[PDB]
């Protein structure tokens, strides 16, 4: 055969797409607590 393989028109062995879970894992909860009252936090405890 006169022409050797030029190498053009290549391919990539075992190309998998990005993993897509079907289970649809639960959303991650936050790390910062809810900004409640800024100056009167955690009750007052009124006396008699």
């Amino acid at each position: 055969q006169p022409r050797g393989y030029a190498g053009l028109r290549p391919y990539e062995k075992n190309y998998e797409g990005i993993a897509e879970a079907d289970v649809s894992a639960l959303q991650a909860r936050y790390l910062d607590q809810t900004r409640g009252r800024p100056r009167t936090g955690d009750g007052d405890t009124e006396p008699i």
Binding site: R29, Y30, Q33, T34, G36, D42, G43
Partner: protein, 48 residues
């Protein structure tokens, strides 16, 4: 955001409601009962 923002709004005034929790609401315990059946039966009426 969402329900998570309520869960983390936790403090001293929650203790009387949820501290050292005793129960949940998300699992009902049903009580196994005796086996029985109900039947509607006609009685005889004496007299006119």
């Amino acid at each position: 955001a969402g329900g998570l923002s309520q869960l983390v709004a936790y403090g001293a005034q929650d203790v009387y409601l949820t501290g050292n929790p005793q129960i949940t609401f998300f699992k009902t315990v049903y009580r196994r009962y005796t086996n029985f059946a109900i039947e509607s039966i006609q009685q005889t009426i004496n007299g006119s």
